[PDB]
Each structure stands twice: as structure tokens, then as C-alpha cells.
Scaffold this active site. Structure first.
Site, mmCIF file in Angstrom:
data_model
loop_
_atom_site.group_PDB
_atom_site.id
_atom_site.type_symbol
_atom_site.label_atom_id
_atom_site.label_comp_id
_atom_site.label_asym_id
_atom_site.label_seq_id
_atom_site.Cartn_x
_atom_site.Cartn_y
_atom_site.Cartn_z
ATOM 1 N N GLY A 20 -16.310 -5.692 65.411
ATOM 2 C CA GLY A 20 -16.848 -5.270 66.682
ATOM 3 C C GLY A 20 -16.510 -3.800 66.820
ATOM 4 O O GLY A 20 -15.447 -3.371 66.378
ATOM 5 N N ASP A 23 -17.383 2.622 69.646
ATOM 6 C CA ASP A 23 -17.202 4.034 69.293
ATOM 7 C C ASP A 23 -17.020 4.884 70.558
ATOM 8 O O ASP A 23 -16.413 5.958 70.519
ATOM 9 C CB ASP A 23 -18.390 4.540 68.465
ATOM 10 C CG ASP A 23 -18.134 5.903 67.834
ATOM 11 O OD1 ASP A 23 -16.954 6.284 67.663
ATOM 12 O OD2 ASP A 23 -19.119 6.588 67.484
ATOM 13 N N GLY A 117 -17.491 -2.036 49.319
ATOM 14 C CA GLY A 117 -16.488 -0.956 49.318
ATOM 15 C C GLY A 117 -16.242 -0.350 47.935
ATOM 16 O O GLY A 117 -15.153 0.132 47.640
ATOM 17 N N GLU A 151 -11.907 11.241 49.250
ATOM 18 C CA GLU A 151 -13.281 10.840 49.546
ATOM 19 C C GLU A 151 -13.838 11.706 50.681
ATOM 20 O O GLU A 151 -15.023 12.044 50.678
ATOM 21 C CB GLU A 151 -13.367 9.337 49.822
ATOM 22 C CG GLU A 151 -14.791 8.816 49.898
ATOM 23 C CD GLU A 151 -14.889 7.298 49.815
ATOM 24 O OE1 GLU A 151 -13.849 6.584 49.790
ATOM 25 O OE2 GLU A 151 -16.036 6.814 49.762
ATOM 26 N N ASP A 163 -11.423 1.019 54.320
ATOM 27 C CA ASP A 163 -11.806 0.491 53.006
ATOM 28 C C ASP A 163 -10.710 0.745 51.982
ATOM 29 O O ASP A 163 -10.505 -0.061 51.066
ATOM 30 C CB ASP A 163 -13.118 1.109 52.519
ATOM 31 C CG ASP A 163 -14.334 0.604 53.286
ATOM 32 O OD1 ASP A 163 -14.264 -0.485 53.893
ATOM 33 O OD2 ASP A 163 -15.375 1.296 53.253
#
Ligand SMILES: [Ca+2]
EC number: 2.7.1.168
Lengths: 314, 328
Positions: A20, A23, A117, A151, A163
Site C-alpha cells: 500500500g 506517497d 528485483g 544503483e 529491493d
């Protein structure tokens, strides 16, 4: 017995089981969401071998990419396995302070663009190979963090290092977000039979085809899933996992799965050519799988794994 | 909440990694030989559901078989899933003393005919389902015995309870045979990385082939190879382990099974050409398979070449546990 100049790592991929998001901050405590993921027995495998000819080799046959460079402290981008250069460049800058000579070889159990992922799992896997080889003082947390920063340099990321936490820590992880940046990871101890029952009711199929009231109930959905997890309440767990999941070629196969027993279905990725994950009564699981084998894609068996990235020397 | 009237069991299949035979008075011990097997992540799944309507249902869709009978003490043979009747009959004769009403559903992760301990693995999973459901006083060894008795008597297998112990106990098991009678089972505690390294070096391929119209002293070194393989396992000496496994795989019975067929021989060739350095063919029948040793940095390309053939590569891990069960 063994020469001991070879390191290997094995890093599992993961499945988003539920989640859920808010943001937009609004809670009294700045809670912005949750994710429940779990590592599965599909992996990224790395092998790192010390060399003595002043060469550096990057070999990733599953992406049809092979590189050979002269050993030096910094490798400039050339559009081929640049992610490996960033990792190497960082390891040298932060820890060794000098060039290294070695061969790095990697492949994934699933084709590129699967949505489990893979990008983060690879980075983690490779960083662990360097850490084990070089005896770097880096715990599991420091590895996931370093993987996230690397990353981040090459591309933009939202949802924090979630991840990277999945790949490093493994198991079922319940993640809670705050201010869409801070992440609180709850690595859960799940009784073995719960995972076993979930696996017995699950089918993973690769397709091979490359509102505000809802937002405000998110926190309570989380408490309920966690509550269902420790109580080992499948009725509820199955009830809320099915809920969390509430024109194309995907919709046709969804229909085909339900007509053969699946009572719930979900996609993810790269939500197109990736995978579909279904729930089915175990007494119906075989027939369902038989039906899906007839289609274009393929069914992938798996189990939930208890641990994250592992490494060893040979 | 949970209803708790459903029992499920999951039992792993096994892979014969190495073995050798010595018959019989070659040693003063009466050492018949040895076998080293290990359970893998390919399973037989069983679900047993209690029902209160005096019915007994046996459901095995992977074999397209479905039986329904009236609840009674003894179920006579009729050619459809007679293996479950023997199990049922024995559970009633030796424990419950009365009829039972339930439905039993099963299926395997691998096709019929495979040489991975399929029959023993099935009997163990079912027996375990009844034991869990009925709270029978049955340890793991007692379940393997029961499984073995049922399998030798109501079928016709001979050679020892090898497959039943692997399915029940799981993990890596080194078994030594004495006078073709006493099976000494050594359930090995193996360092996890050993298993991981073995997995990194191996590829399992089901062929989907159908064949068509295409010593007197070395046998004495078998008991030596056994103690050497235990020591290498204990020592985590992978260089020597690879070496000794490599050896036992070049016998006669392995090379003969490969060469005795043009299509298997071609597949072996193709595998060696692509990175494999050793392989064996097991249960070469309805659904035979090949098991290869390959350099991990070459495994992907080997898998890639094999996926273009009529068979399929089966990923797997070595598992730590034998049969597991739970109630839901
Ligand atoms: Ca970079």
C-alpha cells in the site's frame, strides 16, 4: 583440498506479495506505505576469480555481454556492463585504493525484464563477491546500502533501498515507509509450514511476451496482514492478499487460469511480459499447471527461501 | 481461523550421486557396497481431507486416475491406484481397527518413469499424511520401514530400504550395505556451501527420448572409494570430491547406457562440447534423465544449448529435510 582463489555468491530474487502506498504525507506520524515481499528460489549467480595477468574480465552471457579491460583504478563507461564498472570503481575508491585483476561471471535464473528485483539482486550479488574476496568490513546492512547508492548514481530510485534489503536479508520482510524516504525493515520469522502452505497454493507463470478512503485504511491493512501472519491465519491472510489485488493478452490467460481453478491472480514488472502469480486450491494446482503449459509462456516452480545473499570460497 | 480438517505432506525426490556394488565375501565384513544419495527440491505433494459421508476418494490427476469407494476395512484390488489401497488397508489393519472416510489427492513435480525414487517417495508421503491425521505413534524410521514393507510385498522391489530412508530422512545420506541385509545409513551433516557448490556445478536434464533401432580386482577398490568419499565430504574437500565422483561415473553400466543409444550419446557429446566434463544417465526409461558436472562459469551456455533440444533442464537445490507435514 581447495585452491581458495574463487568466490561465488548466490542471491535470490523476490516477490511483491502485497503493498500500500501514500506517497502524499498525511498521517500524524508521516507513514507513507508498506510492502510485504519474500525471496524465492530463483537466483542470480556470480563467480569471481582472482587473476595475475593485470586483466579485468566481465562475463555476463545471459545478456550476451563480455568485456576485457586492462587493470586500473578507474573504468570509464562504454555502454557495456557499465553497472559492473560502477561497482568496481566504488570498491577501489572506498576500500582497496589500488587496481585489481580478476574475472567476474554472472547469470540469472530468469530472462531479463522479469520484475523480480533483478537489477538490485545483481548489484547485491556482485558487491558480496568483492566483500568476501577482499575481506571488506561490511555487514548485510552496509551491503544493501552500498548497492542502493551504486544503483542511484546510474539511475533514479523511489521507495528507498527496499529491493536491496530483500536481496540481502532474504526471507519475508515487512517494510514500513516514512516520508517516502525512510524505510523500517521488519525481518519476519514465519513458521515453515506457512511458507509451505503458501507455496502449495501458488503458481508462478512467465508469459513470455516482453480512493482517499483507500489511502487512509492502508495502515490498518498493514496491521491486519501482520496480525494474520503471526497468528498463522490463512483464512484472513488469503482474504487480505486477495484484496490487495483489487483488453490485453494478460487478461485472456487470467481468464484461462480462473476457468481452471485459480481464485486470484496478479501481474508485476514490467507489468506485461513479466509474470503472473496465481492462487489456487492445492487439490486443483496440478490441473491448472497442465492448462498453462499448453500456452505460450511457462510455469516456474519455486519455494520461499529463508535467507538472502550467500557467499563461499572454493 | 483455520478449519484443521486438512493434512498436507510434501516429500522430496532423490538423486543418486554415487554408488558401487561388491558381492559378497570379497570382504570379511560382508560389505555389499555403498550408495550416496541426496534429496532434491522436486516433490510429491499429498493432501488428505477428512469427510463425513462414508466415502473414500483417491485422486491422482498427474496419472489421470480417480477412485471412489464406500468406507470399509479392506479395499480389494481393481487396477486403479492399488498402491493407495495397500496403504489404506495396512493403516486399518495395524492401527485404527475401523473404517475411515476421507479424500486423498496427490501429484509429482516430475513425470512418470523418472529414476528419482518416485514410488518410495509417494508411499512415504501418503503414510505420513495418515500418521499426522490419525496421530499414530510413528517416528521417521518407522515410517520408512512401513513404506519399504508395503513396497517390497505389494510390488516387487529388492535392494534395501535406500529410497525410503532418503525420502523420510532427507539430506545427504551415505548408505553402506552388509551381507545384502543390514543397511547402515549415515545421515550426513554437510556444510551448506558444499551443497551450494555441488548445485553450481550441476545440470539436470530430462531427455524426452524414445529409443529406436540405432573388473575382477577393480571391484575391490569400491570400499576404498567409499571411505575416500566420506572423508572428502567431511573434509569439505571439493577438489577430491569432484575427482572421486568423476571416477565412479566411468564404470561400464554408465558408459554403456550412454553409448547404447545414438540420441543419448549425441546429447552427452553436445553437453561435453558445451562445458560439461562429466555426466550419467539414470533410470533410462519412459522419462530418463542425464545429470552433468559443469564448470559454473560455463553452466549458462550449457543450459542454453540443452534448452534447444527436445528435453528440458530442471533447476533444483539439495534439501535438508525429508518428508514434512502440516495441518490447516
Ligand atoms: Ca556509474
Amino acid at each position: 583440498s581447495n585452491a581458495m582463489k574463487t568466490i561465488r555468491t548466490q542471491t535470490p530474487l523476490r516477490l511483491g506479495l502485497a503493498g500500500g502506498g501514500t506517497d502524499i504525507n498525511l498521517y500524524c506520524d508521516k507513514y507513507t506505505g508498506y510492502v510485504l515481499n519474500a525471496t524465492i528460489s530463483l537466483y542470480i549467480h556470480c563467480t569471481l576469480i582472482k587473476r595475475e595477468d593485470g586483466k579485468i574480465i566481465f562475463d555476463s552471457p545471459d545478456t550476451n555481454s563480455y568485456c576485457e579491460y586492462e587493470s586500473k583504478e578507474f573504468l570509464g563507461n562504454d555502454g557495456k556492463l557499465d553497472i559492473f564498472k560502477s561497482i568496481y570503481n566504488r570498491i577501489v575508491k572506498d576500500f582497496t585504493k589500488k587496481p585489481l585483476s580478476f574475472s567476474l561471471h554472472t547469470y540469472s535464473d530468469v530472462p531479463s525484464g522479469s520484475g523480480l528485483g533483478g537489477s538490485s539482486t545483481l548489484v547485491v550479488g556482485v558487491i558480496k563477491a568483492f566483500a568476501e574476496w577482499l575481506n571488506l568490513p561490511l555487514g548485510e546492512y552496509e551491503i544493501a546500502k552500498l548497492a542502493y547508492e551504486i544503483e542511484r548514481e546510474d539511475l533514479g530510485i523511489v521507495g528507498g533501498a527496499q529491493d536491496q534489503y530483500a536481496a540481502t536479508f532474504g526471507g519475508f520482510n515487512f517494510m514500513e515507509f516514512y516520508n517516502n524516504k525512510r524505510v523500517i525493515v521488519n525481518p519476519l520469522r514465519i513458521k515453515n509450514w506457512i511458507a509451505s502452505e503458501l507455496e502449495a497454493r501458488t503458481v508462478l507463470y512467465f508469459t513470455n511476451i516482453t480512493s482517499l478512503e483507500a489511502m487512509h485504511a492502508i495502515k490498518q491493512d498493514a496491521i491486519k496482514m501482520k496480525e494474520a501472519l503471526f497468528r498463522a491465519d490463512f483464512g484472513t491472510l488469503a482474504q487480505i492478499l486477495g484484496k490487495s489485488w483489487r483488453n490485453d493478452e494478460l487478461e485472456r490467460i487470467y481468464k484461462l487460469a480462473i476457468d481452471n481453478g485459480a481464485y486470484s491472480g496478479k501481474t508485476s514488472g514490467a507489468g506485461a511480459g513479466g509474470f503472473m502469480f496465481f492462487f489456487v486450491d492445492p487439490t486443483k494446482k496440478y490441473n491448472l499447471i497442465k492448462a498453462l503449459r499448453k500456452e505460450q509462456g511457462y510455469v516456474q516452480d519455486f519455494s520461499f527461501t529463508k535467507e538472502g545473499v550467500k557467499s563461499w570460497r572454493i
